[PDB]
Curated annotation (Swiss-Prot):
Additional facts recorded: Reduces and may activate fusogenic properties of HIV-1 gp120 surface protein, thereby enabling HIV-1 entry into the cell.
Protein name (database record): Protein disulfide-isomerase
Role noted for this protein: This multifunctional protein catalyzes the formation, breakage and rearrangement of disulfide bonds. At the cell surface, seems to act as a reductase that cleaves disulfide bonds of proteins attached to the cell. May therefore cause structural modifications of exofacial proteins. Inside the cell, seems to form/rearrange disulfide bonds of nascent proteins. At high concentrations and following phosphorylation by FAM20C, functions as a chaperone that inhibits aggregation of misfolded proteins. At low concentrations, facilitates aggregation (anti-chaperone activity).
Natural source organism: Homo sapiens (Human)
Residues with N6-acetyllysine modification: K65
Amino acid sequence: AATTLPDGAAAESLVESSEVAVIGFFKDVESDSAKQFLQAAEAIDDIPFGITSNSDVFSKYQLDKDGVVLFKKFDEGRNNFEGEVTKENLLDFIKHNQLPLVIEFTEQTA
C-alpha cells in the first residue's frame, strides 16, 4: 500500500523512516497510470510506498511531469522509472532498485 505524502517534507522524512522506500509523483493519482501504482504496491507491504500529486514534491526533484522513482540509502540513492507505468513493470523496478546483485552464477549468455 502507498501512503499519502502531504509535501516534500515527507519525501525526505520517508526515505529516513526506513532504509528502502519509494515515492511516485503522479499529477492525476485518480487516473489509470496511478491505479497500477497502488495495485503493484499492494504486492509488497514491508516497503513504505508513498505517492503524491502536490507541486512542492514535484519541483523538488525537478519533474516537468509525472514520474515514479525509488529512494534508498545504499548504492546511488535515487533512480528513474521509464517506459510505461504498469504493475508488471513496477514489481520489476522495485526488485531492480533495492537489493544489489549477488556473488553467484555469471549469467551464461554471451
